[PDB]
Amino acid sequence: GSSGSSGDYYEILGVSRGASDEDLKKAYRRLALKFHPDKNHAPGATEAFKAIGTAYAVLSNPEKRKQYDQFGSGPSSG
DSSP states (O other): OSSSSSOOHHHHTOOOOTOOHHHHHHHHHHHHHHSSSOOOHHOOOOOOHHHHHHHHHHHSHHHHHHHHHHHHOOOOOO
């Protein structure tokens, strides 16, 4: 394997590398609902929701996914 503390979309959601849409969705949801600002009471959790999506929105798209699987986010920093 390779060092962690990297941050991968698939991981953020909690799936394997190459998960289909349905899979990405199901998981993404189960999470959002838990980190939702309407369901959750504490912000700490909500703040995460923002991240989760960002990952899903990618794997959800064929261009954003295929590109992420082939190369990946990269050295891109925030």
